[PDB]
Amino acid sequence: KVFGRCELAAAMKRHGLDNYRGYSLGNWVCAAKFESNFNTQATNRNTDGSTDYGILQINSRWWCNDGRTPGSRNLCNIPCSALLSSDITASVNCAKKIVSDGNGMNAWVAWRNRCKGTDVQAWIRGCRL
Numbered sequence: 630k631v632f633g634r635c636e637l638a639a640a641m642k643r644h645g646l647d648n649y650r651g652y653s654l655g656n657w658v659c660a661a662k663f664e665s666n667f668n669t670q671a672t673n674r675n676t677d678g679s680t681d682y683g684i685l686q687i688n689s690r691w692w693c694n695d696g697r698t699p700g701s702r703n704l705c706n707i708p709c710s711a712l713l714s715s716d717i718t719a720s721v722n723c724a725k726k727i728v729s730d731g732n733g734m735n736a737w738v739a740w741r742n743r744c745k746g747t748d749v750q751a752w753i754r755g756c757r758l
């Protein structure tokens with residue numbers, strides 16, 4: 630599923646991400662834009678043999694089991710394919726763990742490089758939330 634900006638903003642808010650660990654909703658929307666272009670089906674292989682899955686590109690090195698990432702962890706206790714559903718529940722629940730790992734949203738290098746320090750309000754402008 631390719632979400633619209635406001636559709637994703639609404640879903641993320643419903644699932645408790647607005648101000649989660651102090652990160653406003655626009656941060657999460659911005660992160661999803663640059664991680665996946667709002668596409669739940671997005672997958673991308675990392676140089677180390679892990680893969681990133683879903684709207685927030687969650688990495689199999691640490692967070693989910695994809696059956697092909699040796700010597701990795703599954704801290705969200707899920708198959709990575711669950712992170713590709715039209716329904717973002719699994720991605721959101723796992724993201725809540727990630728953002729608590731010590732680095733906050735810096736865990737998403739695309740957030741740090743493209744969203745951090747921006748007028749993130751722009752991402753939810755116009756949306757009826």
Ligand SMILES: [Cl-]
Binds near residue numbers: 650732733734
């Ligand atoms: Cl933080």
Ligand code: NA
Binds near residue numbers: 690698
């Ligand atoms: Na894993």
